[PDB]
Amino acid sequence: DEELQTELYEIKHQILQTMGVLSLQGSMLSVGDKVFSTNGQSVNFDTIKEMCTRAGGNIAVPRTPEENEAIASIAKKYNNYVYLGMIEDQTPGDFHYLDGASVSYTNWYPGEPRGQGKEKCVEMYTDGTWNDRGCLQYRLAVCEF
Amino acid sequence: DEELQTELYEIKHQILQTMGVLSLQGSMLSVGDKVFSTNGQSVNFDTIKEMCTRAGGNIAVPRTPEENEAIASIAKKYNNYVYLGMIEDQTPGDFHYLDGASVSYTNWYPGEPRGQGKEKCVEMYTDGTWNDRGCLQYRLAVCEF
Amino acid sequence: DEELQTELYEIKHQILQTMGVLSLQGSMLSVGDKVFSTNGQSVNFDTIKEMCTRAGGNIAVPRTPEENEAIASIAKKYNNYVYLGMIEDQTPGDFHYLDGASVSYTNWYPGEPRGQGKEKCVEMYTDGTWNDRGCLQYRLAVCEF
Numbered sequence: 308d309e310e311l312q313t314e315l316y317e318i319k320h321q322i323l324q325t326m327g328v329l330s331l332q333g334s335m336l337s338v339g340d341k342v343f344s345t346n347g348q349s350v351n352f353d354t355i356k357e358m359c360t361r362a363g364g365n366i367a368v369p370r371t372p373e374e375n376e377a378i379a380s381i382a383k384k385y386n387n388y389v390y391l392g393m394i395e396d397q398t399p400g401d402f403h404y405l406d407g408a409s410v411s412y413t414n415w416y417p418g419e420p421r422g423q424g425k426e427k428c429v430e431m432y433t434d435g436t437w438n439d440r441g442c443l444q445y446r447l448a449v450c451e452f
Numbered sequence: 453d454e455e456l457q458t459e460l461y462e463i464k465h466q467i468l469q470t471m472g473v474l475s476l477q478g479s480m481l482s483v484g485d486k487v488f489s490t491n492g493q494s495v496n497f498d499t500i501k502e503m504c505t506r507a508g509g510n511i512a513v514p515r516t517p518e519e520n521e522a523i524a525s526i527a528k529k530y531n532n533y534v535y536l537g538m539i540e541d542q543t544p545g546d547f548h549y550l551d552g553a554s555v556s557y558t559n560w561y562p563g564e565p566r567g568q569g570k571e572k573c574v575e576m577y578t579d580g581t582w583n584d585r586g587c588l589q590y591r592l593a594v595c596e597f
Numbered sequence: 598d599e600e601l602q603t604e605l606y607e608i609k610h611q612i613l614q615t616m617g618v619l620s621l622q623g624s625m626l627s628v629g630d631k632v633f634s635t636n637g638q639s640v641n642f643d644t645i646k647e648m649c650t651r652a653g654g655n656i657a658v659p660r661t662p663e664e665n666e667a668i669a670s671i672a673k674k675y676n677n678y679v680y681l682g683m684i685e686d687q688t689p690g691d692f693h694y695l696d697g698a699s700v701s702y703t704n705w706y707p708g709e710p711r712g713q714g715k716e717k718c719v720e721m722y723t724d725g726t727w728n729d730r731g732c733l734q735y736r737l738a739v740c741e742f
């Protein structure tokens with residue numbers, strides 16, 4: 308319908324406005340079709356997953372250098388490491404996304420991972436590099452939508 | 453159209469993202485299809501209605517236990533009673549929503565209401581129970597959209 | 598489709614909810630189909646344009662008295678002048694929007710503009726009136742979407 312087109316125009320405009328306000332005020336970061344945001348809290352891995360899922364999203368995980376840089380900027384902004392959305396396989400050294408798929412893009416800090424299976428989780432340093440670590444530390448909660 | 457379907461997908465995704473960010477940061481609470489939010493201000497009944505209507509919403513009113521609990525959490529978060537969207541009928545003891553319909557769900561604190569017609573408004577204690585009270589007190593402004 | 602209509606209803610409702618929350622909390626101001634918002638930062642003209650464009654919007658510019666009043670309220674809220682989206686033509690005294698079109702609506706403070714071509718930018722005083730000024734001062738960044 309000619310009216311359907313105009314209705315969609317207004318809808319898209321309003322979305323742009325709301326997303327623009329959130330972006331301008333630093334409430335969220337947009338990279339491609341992914342949106343990253345934090346509540347500023349520092350809690351453990353399980354708690355982060357819960358906070359994100361409750362908000363309708365998921366604990367963040369970078370799959371491209373650009374996405375990695377975005378999360379890194381948030382970690383730097385709050386000066387704290389960030390737990391990423393991935394866990395170690397049965398075979399130490401190998402990690403998978405929470406959906407089970409094997410991790411593709413990686414940005415390990417030189418020498419990592421080397422937890423020998425004792426560090427199932429992955430944290431991001433403020434410079435963007437990763438380190439396998441235990442899952443009970445308090446880390447900045449960053450979600451992706 | 454095949455293009456209409458994809459366009460709608462993106463629109464729905466963006467809405468999820470914006471709602472997710474607002475939710476994650478505690479800017480609003482979602483219960484079913486209703487959204488509750490506050491500006492943190494404590495003013496009287498008439499002022500609250502104005503603030504909500506100006507924002508495109510209405511002074512909040514719970515119609516289910518779950519909705520009641522949501523508003524109660526906000527009242528507890530700011531440690532202040534909340535005026536609800538309802539007023540006393542001509543017949544003391546009977547209350548109606550601002551649209552005129554008789555109140556169905558209620559959660560009166562034991563013994564309430566007992567203002568004998570001198571307390572036309574309804575405030576929510578931080579534990580979620582209600583009390584009929586005058587409309588000139590300063591209460592947390594909670595709106596529903 | 599009957600389903601397309603219902604899907605659109607929900608979409609429009611959600612947008613109203615998100616816009617309502619942003620409005621209630623003072624994150625943005627809505628005037629007609631235009632949305633104004635600020636990140637609270639005070640920087641020069643070029644920096645403001647960049648901040649706005651990066652957020653998906655543009656440095657604000659009022660085209661009606663109502664739009665002017667909205668921006669003025671933000672300037673007053675933060676107690677700081679606001680750079681507007683317009684620059685002086687080659688012919689001193691004449692200004693155009695950043696798209697090149699000649700400025701229509703104006704609200705110059707009595708006597709302005711009188712920079713004689715040395716003040717290419719336009720700033721808004723907290724009372725809403727304008728003054729042509731250099732573009733290197735630090736002014737409140739207000740964007741429109």
Ligand SMILES: OC[C@H]1O[C@H](O)[C@@H](O)[C@@H](O)[C@@H]1O
Pocket residue numbers: 419421422426438439440441
């Ligand atoms: O605290 C654990 C942490 O300590 C150091 O940073 C390194 O040995 C890391 O590989 C290890 O994960």
Ligand SMILES: OC[C@H]1O[C@H](O)[C@@H](O)[C@@H](O)[C@@H]1O
Pocket residue numbers: 564566567571583584585586
């Ligand atoms: O301040 C008025 C308020 O006082 C007490 O809380 C009770 O008597 C309530 O029923 C009444 O509404």
Ligand SMILES: OC[C@H]1O[C@H](O)[C@@H](O)[C@@H](O)[C@@H]1O
Pocket residue numbers: 709711712716728729730731
């Ligand atoms: O600082 C420059 C500024 O000074 C005064 O406010 C007036 O002369 C203005 O016209 C001029 O733009």
Ligand SMILES: [Ca+2]
Pocket residue numbers: 419420421422426438439440
């Ligand atoms: Ca390690």
Ligand SMILES: [Ca+2]
Pocket residue numbers: 564565566567571583584585
């Ligand atoms: Ca009472």
Ligand SMILES: [Ca+2]
Pocket residue numbers: 709710711712716728729730
């Ligand atoms: Ca001047």
Ligand code: NA
Pocket residue numbers: 395399400420421422423424425426427439
């Ligand atoms: Na390990």
Ligand code: NA
Pocket residue numbers: 540544545565566567568569570571572584
């Ligand atoms: Na009463």
Ligand code: NA
Pocket residue numbers: 685689690710711712713714715716717729
């Ligand atoms: Na000039």
